[PDB]
């Protein structure tokens, strides 16, 4: 369970104390972690990651590698406090303002922040299509939710994102079908003993960062166990076809 910073940056007194109180509960050392860090004057100066920019001669797959490297440099947020509030129903232009702030302030992030950043950083790539892909999995009597940014370049499929696991985020845009991309994620979940239950597929997101349209996160919802393997593939390919036809 996570707290969300809702007061902007800098983090206000109540939210900052809540973060440290949470750390003291979770970390076996507890108060000594805060004792060492809070007010310390010798802490490392972390470089602000450089936002990637692209010459027109750089191929799009190489740009995507740089976007993912940038996302990774921010680091996965293990503090227990999410530093940016993401209201998923916001107009795209407001989520793009937030993405800009994420690049300016350079704090750790988790999967949903990464999806917003991936859009922000690929709006300059009109020959690339971007659409969210959400997963619901099951392990040891609990459900887990995850989100990545699906991408489509030159008829191939890939993904950008942020996960604590290496094989649950970045996928180079090499998969011939959307089915093959999603089945790769399913296999990666299987390898860490999670059962994939649901996949939710969004529609393509405008490249206009001033668009007032909403992101459509749950356009297609697939019940993996109920559909079975053959209809799972069929539905995935139906979502992909609709997206391509609509373009």
């Amino acid at each position: 369970p996570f707290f969300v910073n809702r007061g902007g940056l800098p983090v206000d007194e109540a939210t900052w104390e809540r973060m440290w109180k949470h750390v003291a509960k979770i970390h076996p050392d507890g108060e000594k972690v805060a004792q060492r860090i809070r007010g310390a004057t010798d802490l490392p100066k972390i470089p602000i990651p450089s936002v990637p920019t692209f010459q027109p001669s750089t191929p799009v797959p190489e740009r995507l590698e740089a976007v993912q490297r940038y996302i990774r440099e921010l680091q996965y947020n293990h503090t227990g406090t999410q530093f940016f509030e993401i209201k998923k129903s916001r107009p795209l232009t407001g989520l793009m303002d937030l993405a800009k702030e994420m690049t300016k302030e350079a704090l750790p992030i988790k999967c949903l922040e990464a999806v917003i950043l991936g859009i922000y950083l690929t709006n300059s790539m009109p020959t690339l299509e971007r659409f969210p892909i959400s997963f619901k999995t099951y392990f040891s009597g609990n459900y887990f939710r995850h989100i990545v940014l699906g991408v489509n370049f030159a008829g191939r499929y890939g993904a950008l994102g942020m996960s604590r696991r290496e094989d649950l985020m970045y996928k180079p845009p090499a998969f011939r079908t959307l089915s093959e991309l999603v089945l790769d994620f399913e296999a990666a979940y299987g390898r860490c003993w999670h059962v994939l239950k649901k996949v939710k597929l969004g529609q393509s997101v405008s490249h206009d960062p001033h668009s007032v349209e909403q992101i459509e996160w749950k356009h297609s919802v697939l019940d993996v166990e109920r559909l079975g393997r053959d209809d799972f593939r069929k539905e995935l390919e139906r979502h992909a076809r609709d997206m391509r036809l609509k373009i």
């Binding site: 490392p44 100066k45 750790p108």
Partner: peptide, 26 residues
């Protein structure tokens, strides 16, 4: 800027904390 100073001080503590918590969640 006082606000800029706060954010720089907080960002250093956030990344120092994140290193500790990442080492914990391995």
């Amino acid at each position: 800027s006082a606000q800029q100073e706060l954010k720089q001080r907080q960002r250093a503590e956030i990344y120092a904390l994140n290193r500790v918590m990442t080492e914990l969640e391995q």
